[PDB]
């Protein structure tokens with residue numbers, strides 16, 4: 001459609017978490033939407049990145065296993081949450097808890113894919129809390145875009161919160 | 176304060192996944208004006224029974240004195256609170272209730288309504304801290320559509336709330 005994509009651009013602007021949309025009917029898998037808390041999180045500008053692949057937040061090859069899961073989830077049209085080593089436009093390193101969620105299309109061939117980025121080590125004291133809170137918030141945005149139904153939202157919010165914290169517990173566990 | 180917002184407060188309440196209530200602050204009795212199905216399902220009531228009543232009906236009297244004082248303070252000041260209350264369902268079954276209060280409408284120290292969101296504790300067979308924080312983050316996004324919070328402070332209030340909620344279950348866990 002086209003009414004839907006416009007509602008998506010709306011949610012993206014007024015959103016309090018980082019949000020990226022990429023087109024899946026294009027082989028490079030390009031960004032068609034990056035939102036202000038994302039641009040401000042990475043340092044880039046909506047024009048110097050829109051049309052490319054969010055791979056650019058990576059240097060070299062630091063995320064072999066995580067990139068494998070990503071490529072499989074994109075192929076399958078499945079949600080994924082995964083920690084990546086990223087780098088801002090000023091090449092300062094940060095860990096990115098990435099949330100992936102298929103948008104539009106058919107269940108095995110979505111039109112777009114949504115990514116939500118949760119920077120680690122920003123918070124006051126609890127990284128589990130901050131990540132779950134991110135997850136909980138993101139669940140609400142996803143419901144707005146109309147990817148999730150208005151019933152499956154009380155479990156989905158807690159699943160995502162559990163998964164996000166379970167991942168944070170792993171991230172810290174690497175001593 | 177104004178309207179157009181009240182049609183979308185209803186819109187939010189009806190489809191939301193968290194327990195949500197709204198209390199009219201222009202009356203000193205402070206009655207429920209909206210209770211959504213997750214709140215109804217959690218407490219064992221139907222909607223037509225509780226509209227018009229003050230939410231203290233979920234209590235057993237003389238129990239949450241410290242909490243109730245903080246709640247009265249929040250309501251008077253017109254600012255937010257998060258507390259834990261001993262509550263009971265319509266069949267007298269006890270549950271613990273992490274309650275999020277948030278001012279809506281009006282002027283700074285005289286809101287038109289207060290919103291409540293109830294998180295039942297101990298029903299998460301995994302991580303209570305993460306479950307409570309997931310709720311807070313989801314509530315924060317919910318409060319952003321009703322117009323109270325929006326833009327930059329919609330991001331900071333979410334991360335604040337997620338932090339506060341976890342700290343509360345951490346305390347809750349401490350005292351047994």
Ligand SMILES: Cc1cc2nc3c(=O)[nH]c(=O)nc-3n(C[C@H](O)[C@H](O)[C@H](O)COP(=O)(O)O)c2cc1C
Pocket residue numbers: 020021022029053054055057058067068070071074084085086096098100113114115116117
């Ligand atoms: C919607 C979406 C958002 C993404 N966000 C990020 C990101 O923030 N950081 C990152 O390193 N990779 C991100 N990726 C992953 C890359 O775009 C890429 O698909 C991934 O690295 C696997 O690709 P590869 O074939 O280059 O190994 C995102 C992917 C999608 C589809």
Ligand SMILES: Cc1cc2nc3c(=O)[nH]c(=O)nc-3n(C[C@H](O)[C@H](O)[C@H](O)COP(=O)(O)O)c2cc1C
Pocket residue numbers: 196197198205229230231233234243244246247250260261262272274276289290291292293
């Ligand atoms: C919006 C809103 C929601 C509330 N939800 C609850 C609740 O779920 N459980 C509860 O015990 N009290 C709840 N309360 C608080 C009671 O209505 C009352 O304010 C509290 O018991 C403290 O006041 P009191 O000492 O006069 O009873 C809520 C209050 C407001 C404004």
